[PDB]
Amino acid sequence: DVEFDALLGSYCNTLSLVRFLELGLSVACVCTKFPELAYMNEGRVQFEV
């Protein structure tokens, strides 16, 4: 007597790694690295217009 329980496949989804400058809404803002903002509570952006 020969009986076997079989594993007929395994499927995995690949989590898509997307960066933020792909999107169309990067038109909408300016991204700049600003480390140390943990240190600083106060903020002001001043541009002379």
Binding site: G24, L25, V27, V30, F47, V49
Partner: protein, 49 residues
């Protein structure tokens, strides 16, 4: 209604120094984020550049 939506605003104060082009290279001045349901019925009956 779009051209009002599209143009009710004031251009910002900024010059990103790297601008989003359109591969012919006209610059992208807008974003226009939507829900996929509206986007669909909007793209088929209206806008296709």
């Amino acid at each position: 209604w779009l051209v009002d939506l599209t143009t009710a605003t004031q251009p910002s104060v900024a010059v990103p120094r790297l601008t989003h082009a359109d591969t012919r290279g006209r610059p992208v001045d807008g974003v226009l984020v939507t829900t996929a349901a509206i986007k669909q019925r909007l793209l088929q009956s209206f806008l296709k550049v």
